[PDB]
Design an enzyme around this catalytic site. Structure first.
Site, mmCIF file in Angstrom:
data_model
loop_
_atom_site.group_PDB
_atom_site.id
_atom_site.type_symbol
_atom_site.label_atom_id
_atom_site.label_comp_id
_atom_site.label_asym_id
_atom_site.label_seq_id
_atom_site.Cartn_x
_atom_site.Cartn_y
_atom_site.Cartn_z
ATOM 1 N N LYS A 47 -16.410 -7.310 5.574
ATOM 2 C CA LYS A 47 -15.155 -8.061 5.662
ATOM 3 C C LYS A 47 -14.772 -8.440 7.102
ATOM 4 C CE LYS A 47 -12.677 -5.940 1.687
ATOM 5 N NZ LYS A 47 -11.303 -5.425 1.316
ATOM 6 N N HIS A 69 0.827 -1.200 0.000
ATOM 7 C CA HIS A 69 0.000 0.000 0.000
ATOM 8 C C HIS A 69 0.862 1.249 0.000
ATOM 9 C CE1 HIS A 69 -2.989 -2.863 2.083
ATOM 10 N NE2 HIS A 69 -3.318 -2.767 0.806
ATOM 11 N N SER A 80 -3.588 -6.675 -31.974
ATOM 12 C CA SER A 80 -3.062 -6.581 -33.336
ATOM 13 C C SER A 80 -2.860 -7.974 -33.961
ATOM 14 C CB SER A 80 -1.769 -5.773 -33.346
ATOM 15 O OG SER A 80 -2.047 -4.391 -33.106
#
Lengths: 155, 155, 155, 155
Positions: free
Chosen positions: D40, D16, D127
């Site tokens: 959570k 983080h 591509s």
């Protein structure tokens, strides 16, 4: 052949059933291992999760669902199992998967692909990476089988 | 059981050998299929690539390497093969792979994991996603086995 | 602010235009850098690829397309650019992307997400991994900022 | 320019901090948004998580940490923010990242890469995929900018 598909299954989803369907085709027995996962604070109890996945898998005759508390590698040992099953949470390999789709209804059909995650060392190795090193007269000796190195590099 | 591991192998690398080693443990016979890949303009000829991967795999007794021009799904048909092998070019699942490492020397040992790529529909399904929908009193009926829907949702 | 979006563009696709559209919103100037890529043996010449992407980007007023032979980091130096742009070839983060979609028409709207690839060290670090280590009274000192370690671990 | 980096931060990790460090270089102000995440069942309280990430970020002068309950898109609206920041939990793009490393100490230096996740439509466009379609005289009209289609296909 025993394979183990471990998970929390809180609740079991169509994604899980798809993986169970596909992987159960590969082993004499597929063990679906329902982890307690107390740390995840699951919405449904271990008993409910086991019973639900049992109910949803009873059509797969070679599937057995079992609850366990932890120590997955030791659970594998108990089953004489050396192969685990996991679903990817990443979609990649798009050109390949596009070609497989086309095949899977007009060409061959129903081909499964098993994916192998590279070792940490090997993730940074590709043929393209090796070719680039070759071109810049660099050292590729640590990246290719010793049987072929003399054929692709010198001096 | 026949499995097919297709690729260009321009040249064969340690990553390829690792996948051949691991996947050959799973089938009675592993066919390593060397694609011409004329479009990729390979550095080494098809003959050289086949011979090199043959040389590098001769220790794996149940591995046979074969060159082909294209139509992989029809090559699979010729071998009565419904299972292909592929290496991921993504590393993910780090917590799981960390736990597997620990096991793989002090706990159980030498456990393989086979990864299954989710269908396009199923990539957007997870237990967490389903739980969130449940919490907001939303419709999860298209996301879970019909056997369990009445047990997790109503009205 | 200059950003550089490098690629072979053989040919330019809608995926490329989408990335150019989204990233050009972020810099005072976006340089679209068309690499010769002689090694890839491109279908279209460097001149054709440059002219095509120029034609397809002329509506983005802060975009300039430039051809180059190689040494991307030195091309960045020439532009005083410290930020490159790349498209992912993996789709991940499905729950998050599902929530962003909902927002992007009925809630806030048109929110972009920029993704940062973790350092090799940091890929094996997550809060979940740290919590697990904490629970087993293990050493997390190498995984969290020193400012917080005394608050989450002891002895 | 305001960017928002949302998360649960239970607890804040070096991963983080790395993302905060890198993304704070890009905005006039980076808002680190600490979500309650009641679902959570976090190990640390919202207050503790906010205070810890505040303590760990006080050296980044343009970073402000704020707690919120939910509705991220509306939090973005409040800040006039149209750009969010996220860390990938996948490592990919290995050849590119290998080349960037080399540059990042002997060549240019300290170059950041911003990753853009493809739209669902565009993930199946590359591509290479377009070139293959061209070769088989197929329809690529839905895959490339209209400005270039006449230059790469006909009849």
């Amino acid at each position: 052949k025993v394979g183990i598909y471990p998970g929390t299954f809180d609740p079991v989803t169509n994604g899980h059933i798809d993986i169970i369907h596909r992987s159960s085709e590969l082993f004499e027995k597929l063990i679906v291992a329902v982890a307690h996962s107390s740390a995840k604070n699951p919405m449904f109890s271990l008993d409910e999760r086991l019973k639900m996945i049992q109910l949803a898998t009873k059509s797969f005759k070679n599937v057995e669902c079992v609850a366990f508390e932890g120590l997955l590698a030791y659970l594998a040992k108990e089953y004489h199992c050396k192969v685990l099953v996991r679903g990817l949470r990443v979609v990649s390999d798009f050109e390949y998967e596009l070609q497989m789709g086309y095949a899977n209804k007009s060409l061959n059909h129903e081909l499964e692909t098993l994916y192998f995650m590279p070792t940490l060392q090997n993730a940074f190795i590709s043929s393209s990476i090796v070719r680039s090193i070759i071109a810049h007269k660099g050292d590729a000796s640590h990246l290719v089988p010793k049987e072929i190195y003399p054929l692709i590099s010198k001096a």
